[PDB]
Design a protein around this ligand. Structure first.
Ligand SMILES: *[C@@H]1O[C@H](CO)[C@@H](O[C@@H]2O[C@H](CO)[C@@H](O)[C@H](O)[C@H]2NC(C)=O)[C@H](O)[C@H]1NC(C)=O
Ligand SMILES: *[C@@H]1O[C@H](CO)[C@@H](O[C@@H]2O[C@H](CO)[C@@H](O)[C@H](O)[C@H]2NC(C)=O)[C@H](O)[C@H]1NC(C)=O
Ligand SMILES: *[C@@H]1O[C@H](CO)[C@@H](O[C@@H]2O[C@H](CO)[C@@H](O)[C@H](O)[C@H]2NC(C)=O)[C@H](O)[C@H]1NC(C)=O
Ligand SMILES: *[C@@H]1O[C@H](CO)[C@@H](O[C@@H]2O[C@H](CO)[C@@H](O)[C@H](O)[C@H]2NC(C)=O)[C@H](O)[C@H]1NC(C)=O
Ligand SMILES: *[C@@H]1O[C@H](CO)[C@@H](O)[C@H](O)[C@H]1NC(C)=O
Ligand SMILES: *[C@@H]1O[C@H](CO)[C@@H](O)[C@H](O)[C@H]1NC(C)=O
Lengths: 206, 49
């Protein structure tokens, strides 16, 4: 299934405050009105240059994601999971299961990094060894499909994991979600008087 | 004169009304000079006119 990304997936490109100003920036962004894949489903998906991920949900069925390349302990992989009390992030040579669910992996070894902390939207980037996560949450009129309108994702964490990533997979607890890929685009960002991005122009759209 | 995390300059540091989001560390001028900064110890926001 497919659906259309109605200006969703903009995020704060840097930690510099700006207000009442229009600023042009060149970065990996989800192009406006992009053809995004629609799931209802836990197959392995490519990561490319980065992912936009969104979930529309009511019972918190989606609990996290796994990122990596071989996903078979021959290489390191990144595990991100949100349990009932804490967000947990680990980078280990995980031997993941054929059908992970909350029983994600058979074994874990050579672990070098660990960190412990409606519509829900996320963006995942991997640049020069840094894995950056942005998100925002918002109540919306429907659970089945992606809404209209503009909103900007705030940075959530910036992990210096330093690992190669080419594929990823969603973790479910025993709902619908959307996946889009970021591309190098030039965007003109409108910052309001409160310093929040309130609109954007995808300079290569039309 | 000031030196915030290496950011070195001169100005009349003043308490800022600018509503920096929790992740933001600096503010910029059109010339990309720093216009506001977050104190690395108190985390308060200061104007740099
Ligand atoms: C990151 O991992 C991918 C595998 O997922 C590597 O991809 C290979 O890259 C070489 C060229 O460098 C190609 O000849 C292979 O065909 C690629 N394999 C696949 C399965 O696509 C990639 O090289 C890795 N990069 C780093 C820096 O480790
Ligand atoms: C969420 O994950 C954390 C791990 O980061 C869990 O904390 C561990 O809990 C066990 C007991 O079940 C302790 O033995 C460990 O020492 C804890 N680790 C840390 C780092 O605190 C936490 O219990 C999980 N939450 C739930 C509800 O299962
Ligand atoms: C942990 O990672 C290291 C690589 O950093 C693995 O080292 C390899 O070990 C096998 C024997 O088990 C050797 O044949 C390879 O030549 C080693 N690789 C390198 C680059 O030296 C190690 O196996 C991993 N640990 C486990 C338990 O699998
Ligand atoms: C900028 O932020 C302020 C809050 O810091 C907003 O002011 C509030 O707006 C609501 C209506 O949305 C009023 O009910 C409150 O009384 C206002 N508070 C104050 C202190 O004025 C303001 O609307 C925001 N502006 C924009 C353009 O987002
Ligand atoms: C979205 O892309 C797929 C190919 O991945 C294509 O078959 C489909 O027709 C496209 N849908 C729209 C609405 O453009
Ligand atoms: C640095 O000192 C201030 C008090 O001047 C304190 O509030 C702050 O917590 C300290 N830094 C950290 C990281 O705790």
């Amino acid at each position: 299934a497919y659906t259309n990304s109605f200006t969703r997936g903009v995020y704060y490109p840097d930690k510099v405050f700006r207000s009442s100003v229009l600023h042009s920036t060149q970065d990996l962004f989800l192009p406006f009105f992009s053809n995004v894949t629609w799931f209802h489903d836990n197959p392995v998906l490519p990561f490319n240059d980065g992912v936009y991920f969104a979930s529309t949900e009511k019972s918190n069925i989606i609990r996290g994601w796994i990122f990596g390349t071989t996903l078979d302990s021959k290489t390191q992989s990144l595990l991100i999971v949100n349990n009932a009390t804490n967000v947990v992030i680990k980078v280990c040579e995980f031997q993941f299961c054929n059908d992970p669910f909350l029983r994600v992996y058979s074994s874990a070894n050579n672990c070098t990094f660990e960190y412990v902390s409606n519509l829900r939207e996320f963006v995942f980037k991997n640049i020069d060894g840094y894995f950056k996560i942005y998100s925002k949450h918002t109540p919306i009129n429907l659970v089945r499909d992606l809404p209209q309108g503009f909103s900007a994702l705030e940075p959530l964490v910036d992990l210096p994991i330093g690992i190669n990533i080419t594929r990823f997979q969603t973790l479910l607890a025993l709902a619908a979600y959307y996946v889009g890929y970021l591309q190098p685009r030039t965007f003109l960002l409108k910052y309001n008087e409160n310093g929040t991005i309130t609109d954007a122009v995808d300079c290569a759209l039309d | 004169n000031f030196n915030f995390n290496g950011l070195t300059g001169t100005g009349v540091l003043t308490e800022s009304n600018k509503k920096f989001l929790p992740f933001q560390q600096f503010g910029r001028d059109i010339a990309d000079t720093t216009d506001a900064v977050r104190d690395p110890q108190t985390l308060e926001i200061l104007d740099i006119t």
